[PDB]
């Protein structure tokens, strides 16, 4: 509360560390569905159904331009990529499996780097 604070957690490396995670996600062999924004002209249903599109290139540009206020807003956009993928794609499809695999990969790196 006013004039009562928990001890200051060192957040000075968070930007660098989220960039490293994001690089590892970009270079994963199963990243291909997520590298670029879904083409809303060419994919029926996407625009109406997926209210907040997100992709790795969009996260990279937000990261690089100071549009994440803290590491939790970064994790929210990464998770959005996978939540969108599960909304639109069957579990038993190449893309649906890619999304599960990537979500797992991310959540381990997130735990190991920060928790």
From Swiss-Prot:
| Tissues/organs with expression | Expressed at varying levels in several tissues, whereas a smaller transcript was expressed specifically in testis.
Q: Which domain of life is it from?
A: Eukaryota
| Quaternary assembly | Component of the BRF-1 ISWI chromatin remodeling complex, at least composed of SMARCA1 and BAZ2B, which regulates the spacing of histone octamers on the DNA template to facilitate access to DNA. Within the BRF-1 ISWI chromatin remodeling complex interacts with SMARCA1; the interaction is direct. Component of the BRF-5 ISWI chromatin remodeling complex, at least composed of SMARCA5/SNF2H and BAZ2B, which regulates the spacing of histone octamers on the DNA template to facilitate access to DNA.
- What is the source species? Homo sapiens
Q: Where is the Bromo domain?
A: 9-113
**Family the entry assigns:** Belongs to the WAL family.
Q: What does this protein do?
A: Regulatory subunit of the ATP-dependent BRF-1 and BRF-5 ISWI chromatin remodeling complexes, which form ordered nucleosome arrays on chromatin and facilitate access to DNA during DNA-templated processes such as DNA replication, transcription, and repair. Both complexes regulate the spacing of nucleosomes along the chromatin and have the ability to slide mononucleosomes to the center of a DNA template. The BRF-1 ISWI chromatin remodeling complex has a lower ATP hydrolysis rate than the BRF-5 ISWI chromatin remodeling complex.
Q: Write out the annotated subcellular location.
A: Nucleus
Q: What is this protein called?
A: Bromodomain adjacent to zinc finger domain protein 2B
């Amino acid at each position: 509360s006013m004039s009562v604070k928990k001890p200051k957690r060192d957040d000075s490396k968070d930007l660098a560390l989220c960039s490293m995670i994001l690089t590892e996600m970009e270079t994963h062999e199963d990243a291909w569905p997520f590298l670029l924004p879904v083409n809303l002209k060419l994919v029926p249903g996407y625009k109406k159904v997926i209210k907040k599109p997100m992709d790795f290139s969009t996260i990279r540009e937000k990261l690089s331009s100071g549009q994440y206020p803290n590491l939790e807003t970064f994790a929210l956009d990464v998770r959005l990529v996978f939540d969108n993928c599960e909304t639109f794609n069957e579990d038993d499809s190449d893309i649906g499996r890619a999304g599960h695999n990537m979500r797992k990969y991310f959540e381990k790196k997130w735990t190991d780097t920060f928790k």
